[PDB]
Structure formats: C-alpha cells, structure tokens
Amino acid sequence: SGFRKMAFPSGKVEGCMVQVTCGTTTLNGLWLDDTVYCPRHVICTAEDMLNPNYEDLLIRKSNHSFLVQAGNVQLRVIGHSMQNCLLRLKVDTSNPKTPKYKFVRIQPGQTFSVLACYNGSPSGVYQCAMRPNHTIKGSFLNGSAGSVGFNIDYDCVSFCYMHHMELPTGVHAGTDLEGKFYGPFVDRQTAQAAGTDTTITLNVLAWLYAAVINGDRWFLNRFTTTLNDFNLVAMKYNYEPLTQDHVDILGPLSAQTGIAVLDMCAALKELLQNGMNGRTILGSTILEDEFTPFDVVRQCSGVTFQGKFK
Amino acid sequence: SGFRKMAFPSGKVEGCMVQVTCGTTTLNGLWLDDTVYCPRHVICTAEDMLNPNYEDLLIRKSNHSFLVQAGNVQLRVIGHSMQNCLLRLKVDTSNPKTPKYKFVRIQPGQTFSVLACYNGSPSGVYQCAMRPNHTIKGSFLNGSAGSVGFNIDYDCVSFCYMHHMELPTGVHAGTDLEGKFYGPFVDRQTAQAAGTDTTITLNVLAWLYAAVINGDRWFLNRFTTTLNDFNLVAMKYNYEPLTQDHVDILGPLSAQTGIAVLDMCAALKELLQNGMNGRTILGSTILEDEFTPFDVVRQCS
C-alpha cells in the first residue's frame, strides 16, 4: 500500500556521468563506451549565447581544448564532432561501467526519471513527464546542463533526455540523445516561451483511479456522462481531448475499482468546473497528471474476484 | 528554478542490496563488508509470523538454512546471530562495493530516501519523512521488507531505516540498522496501530521559505510573535511545538531570504487561523511538511 511519485534507481546512470570543461565553461557529460555526449553550448562564453555560430566556434577548438573528468580519472579526448545540438567527444578510455542502453525519443505525456548532476557528480533523482508543450517541470540550477533523463527496463537504460536550459516560466528545455530539441526551442539567447501548457487528461484519470484504490472516493457521486459531454467541459481548462483508446487503457483500473471510465469522467467533469471544495485527493489539492496508467498499475496492483458482477 | 521531492542518487545503495531466502520466505538484505543485515522475520513462516519466539525459532536454523544471493552470485553463509529485530549473516566475502557508510538513528521530522527493492533487485527510489508518530508514508508491496532508507553526505551513505511491517492504516514501520524499531511497534502480527500523527512545524516553515525563494510572497505579513504566542496557536492545529533549536536551524533560509524566523512564524500563525482563501502556495492550498530545512537548501541556491 501507499502511493508515491517514484523514480528509477539511478546507479546505472551515475556510472556514466562525467564533468566536461571548455575554457571557463563547465557542464555535465554522458560517458557511454568511448563517447562522451554533452550539450554543445559548453564551447560558448556567456556573451556568445546571443548569436553563436557553433561550427565556426567549434572549428577553433582542438581535442585538447576539451577537458573531461570522470570522478578523478581525466579522460583524453581523441576526437570530436557536432551532432545537432550536442557534441560527441571520443575518449581513449571506454567506460567500464557502460550499461545496456538505447537512445529513444520520448512522447508527450510519458514519464521519465531525471538524474540531476553538478560538476559531473550526481546530486539527486526525481520523476517527471514530457509535457504536451515539450517542456518539463524540472528542478535545475546553474551547472545542471548535461544531466540526463531515462527509463530503465530490465537491465537496459533507455535515455530520452539531456538538459540544456531554463525558460522564463521556470520550466526546462533539452534534447534527445541525438541532439535534437524537444519542441521549438533553440540553444541561443532569444525570447522563447512554453506554449499553452495543457493537462494530460489520461494521467489525471489514471490518478483518480489511484485515489479510489487508496480510499478517496468522495468525488464519485455523479451519474455517467458521455465522451462528447466530457470533452465539451474539458475544453476551457485546457485538458487534452479524451479518446476511446484512453478509455481502453484505463480498463484494468475500472475493472479493479468497479468504477467505469465514463463514471470517473463524470467526477472529473465536476472537479474541473467547480473545484474540490477544500478537500483532498491522495493528499493533493491539485489534479496530478505526471502518473501514467502504467505508473499507477505498477503501484496499485490488485486481485480479481471471480464471481460474475453486473 | 523548480522544486520537487528529490531523492539521493541510489547507486551506492544499489550495490549493497542482496536477496535472502530462508525457507519459502524471501526478502531483501543489506551487504556491508562480510555481513548481511536483514529483518529477522525471514526465518518465520506465516504460522510463525503470528506470535513467534525468534530465539527459539532461530535455534533450529543453521548456516546452510540461509540462501543469500547478490544477483546471480550465491553467497555462502559463515555464521549468523540476532541483534534485536535484525539477523546478521556472516558470509564468504567482503562486499567489493561497500561504500563508506555509517548507521544513524534519525529523529521525527527528518527525511531520507527509500530504495524500494524486491527479491534483492532494486526497483524504485523516493523521498520519505519519519512522521512524529514514528511511521513512514511509503509505497511498499509484499516482499519489500529489508528495503532501506539512507541519506548521502558527499561519499558517506548514512543508513537510517530498514523496512519491516505495514500497519493497518497502510503506513509503514521499521528499524534502524541496529534492529531497534522506530516507535513502539513489533515484528509480530498482533494488534498495533499508529498513534495520532501531528504536523512537522519545522518543515512547514522550511517549505514557506522555499515558496518565498520560488516567488510566492503573499502570505508574508507584518507582525511577529514570540515562540510562546506561536506555540499556543500551533498546539491547537495539531502542530509540533517549535523549539529554539528549530529556530536556529532555520537561520540560513532566514538569512538567504531576509525573513526573520519569528516573522515567518507570524505568517504561518495567520495561515492557520485564517486559511488561504483561494490563494495558493507553490500551487497548493495545503501546507506541505515533508521537506526539511536542509532539503530546501540543498535544492535552492
């Protein structure tokens, strides 16, 4: 029992974090096999960020302009290139601690764990989701660029995110591990902004099921609605349109709670336009949307009674 | 910017988790040096986990009765003994991944990271606070016993918790790494229930300071209070009494924001007697009490 935002154990990722210095700029790098991946703006001074010319800026660099520290072993960069918005640094030493890994591009609404690093030293870990506007709501200070996001499946770490920068609203932007940003963002000093941040309706619903299993059922006192009637209300509070596929995904949770989906949307309808009236749902006053259906079932598994109900 | 419950990186603990099977019962253990620490009810069966006699139960068992696995590597048990509610198994090898470590007994109000494991395989990491009624609001399934709570001070793992029992209300109970339970609980299926919890006043104030650091200033007002006037308001709202040591611990956040601690207590006192009235604090209408002053600092620089 219990329901908590849970991150993946970070050990396999820690063994890959290194510090990367160029000139007077430092940030973090990802050391896999003989390659160190890091955000390309490590080759920049603060004044360069306004209109950097990365190719020209990098042409000026030699292998020995790049300084890579792994714990204390100094690696030797023996090659370098730019791939989209990342540098790939070839090092002499192949990381003995490399895990099985994939480079994947995560989709909005899915979750991942973040290993926040400073000076190449892991400092903390937490769970977040790729937002529909292609930002994430992280916790990053200066020097955190190069920290990575990841999901672990069996013994394989699948890396989805590398951190680059902060938007004025305090949310964060970065790239996949090929160097391609999520969203419209670019690694130069310019006015950029997160779009209309919508709310991952599928996750809110998944979360509402988690509340029922953990004893919260007060909000369930409405009669079934329809998808069109639910979608209509969900328009102005910026909730993504509910779809049949989303309903199918929640089928296991409806079956375990005995609470049909369109019955749970009846409750969500009420919650959105009239609020919570000062109560709480799983200790929260806000509708949580960074738990996927997968996430909620992993923590809320159950038992199937095999009489035949209605 | 940004502010979230974040746990410590768990790799140093992941390298110490092992699997301990004693009959048909499996839970996790902690392998430091040549010793595997694990909850002693691994030796019970369901019939035993009623009212067991451990020293009795233990006498029948011998070394070969303990299957201990670090991954696929089976370890051979070279001895065994009970220390309070833990077993200590002596084994062939000093764990090569034994980090610098120490055992600590945490106090109510403090937080730690939990590495939830199953069959000796780590599966999740999240942040917890020791409640004043000495329980934990964790997330634990069957076979999570032996999972550990820890903090990390640079390269030293401080182990403060090992998981044993789930209580009726769904909150959790366990021991320090010497096997003494936090709180009055026992590793017996007997009637026992968490006492009435209270709110961790020091951590609510830390959280209001984190709010200020992250923009929210509306609740700041203009009065002050002594400790006494504050505590008389707080007692009413089920809050822990605030001591002068608590005030001192809040110095750095007070200095870094410019709000005197007893000024922040006047702000809090008002929020309890008046409510928030449609306004939010870090987006919430409820007062969070599971961040310590240290957790806020570590994250707000």
Q: Which of B77, B141, B165 is nearest to A4 (CA)?
A: B141
Residues of chain B positioned with their CB less than 8 A from the CB of A170 = 1-2, 214
Provide the 8-state DSSP code for A241.
P
Alpha carbon distances (Å) from A119 to A32, A137, A164, B89: 18, 22, 15, 39
Q: Residue A225's CB: how many other CB atoms inside 10 A?
A: 20
Three-state DSSP class for residue B161: strand
| Beta bridge partner(s), residue A148 | A115, A162
Q: Which secondary structure element, helix H or strand E, spans residue B32, and what is its range? A: strand B26-32
| Contact call for residues B247 and B261 (beta carbons, < 8 A) | yes
| Contact call for residues B267 and B221 (beta carbons, < 8 A) | yes
Provide the 8-state DSSP code for B19.
E
* Strands across the sheet containing B77-83: B73-75, B67-70, B17-21, B26-32, B35-39, B86-91, B77-83
* Elucidated via: X-ray
The chain B residue lying nearest A299, using CA atoms, is: B139
Where does chain B hold its CATH 2.40.10.10 domain(s)?
1-14+100-197, 15-99
CATH class belonging to A15-99? mainly beta
| Contact call for residues B20 and B68 (beta carbons, < 8 A) | yes
Angle, helices B261-274 vs B227-236, to 10°: value is 30
Residue contact B122–A4, C-beta within 8 A: no
Query: HSE-up of B163 (CA within 13 Å, CB side)?
Result: 29
Select the CATH number that applies to the domain covering B1-14+100-197 from these four: 3.30.230.10, 3.40.50.1470, 2.40.10.10, 3.10.20.600. Answer: 2.40.10.10
Provide the 8-state DSSP code for B64.
G
Q: Which of B82, B71, B77, B113 is nearest to B92 (CA)?
A: B77
What is the C-alpha to C-alpha distance for residues A191 and B223, in angstroms, rounded to an integer?
A: 40
Residue contact B170–A11, C-beta within 8 A: no
Three-state DSSP class for residue B45: coil
Considering the segment(s) A198-301 as one domain, its CATH architecture is: Orthogonal Bundle (1.10)
| Beta bridge partner(s), residue A175 | A162, A181
C-alpha distance from A158 to closest chain B C-alpha (Å): 15
What is the C-alpha to C-alpha distance for residues A177 and A86, in angstroms, rounded to an integer?
A: 8
Q: Which secondary structure element, helix H or strand E, spans residue A14, and what is its range? A: helix A11-14
Q: Does A136 touch chain B (CB under 8 A)?
A: no
Token pair of A309, please?
């109900």
Q: Does A5 touch chain B (CB under 8 A)?
A: yes
**In which region does residue B75 sit, left (phi positive, over 0), alpha (psi from -120 to 50) or beta (all else)?**
beta
Token pair of B56, please?
């009795």
| Contact call for residues A30 and A177 (beta carbons, < 8 A) | yes
| Contact call for residues A23 and A57 (beta carbons, < 8 A) | no
The chain A residue lying nearest B117, using CA atoms, is: A9
Q: Residue A245's CB: how many other CB atoms inside 10 A?
A: 8
Query: HSE-up of A62 (CA within 13 Å, CB side)?
Result: 1
Token pair of B257, please?
């924001």
Q: Which of A11, A286, A301 sits opposite B10 (nearest CB)?
A: A11
What is the C-alpha to C-alpha distance for residues B42 and B114, in angstroms, rounded to an integer?
A: 20
Q: Which of B134, B88, B139 is nearest to B113 (CA)?
A: B139
**DSSP states of B263-289:** HHHHHHHHHHHH--TT--BTTBSS---
**DSSP states of B200-236:** -HHHHHHHHHHHHHTT--TT--S----HHHHHHHHHH
Token pair of A195, please?
């779009």
Three-state DSSP class for residue B110: coil
Strands A100-103 and A156-166: parallel
Angle, helices B261-274 vs B201-213, to 10°: value is 100
What is the C-alpha to C-alpha distance for residues A69 and B169, in angstroms, rounded to an integer?
A: 49
Q: Which of B11, B123, B140 sits opposite A2 (nearest CB)?
A: B140
Cα separation of the two ends of chain A: 28
Residue contact A139–B6, C-beta within 8 A: yes
Q: Three-state SS across A57-101?
A: HHHCCCHHHEEEEECCEEECEEEEEEECCEEEEEECCCCCCCCEE
Residue B66 CB-density burial (10 A; 0-12 exposed, 13-18 middle, 19+ buried): buried
Amino acid code (one letter) for B253: L
Three-state DSSP class for residue B187: coil
| Contact call for residues A292 and A110 (beta carbons, < 8 A) | yes
Mutation pick from A117, A123, A126, A153 vs chain B, by most beta carbons of B within 10 Å, is A126
Residues of chain B positioned with their CB less than 8 A from the CB of A138 = 2, 4
Q: Which of A9, A140, A299 sits opposite B122 (nearest CB)?
A: A9
Q: Does A131 touch chain B (CB under 8 A)?
A: no
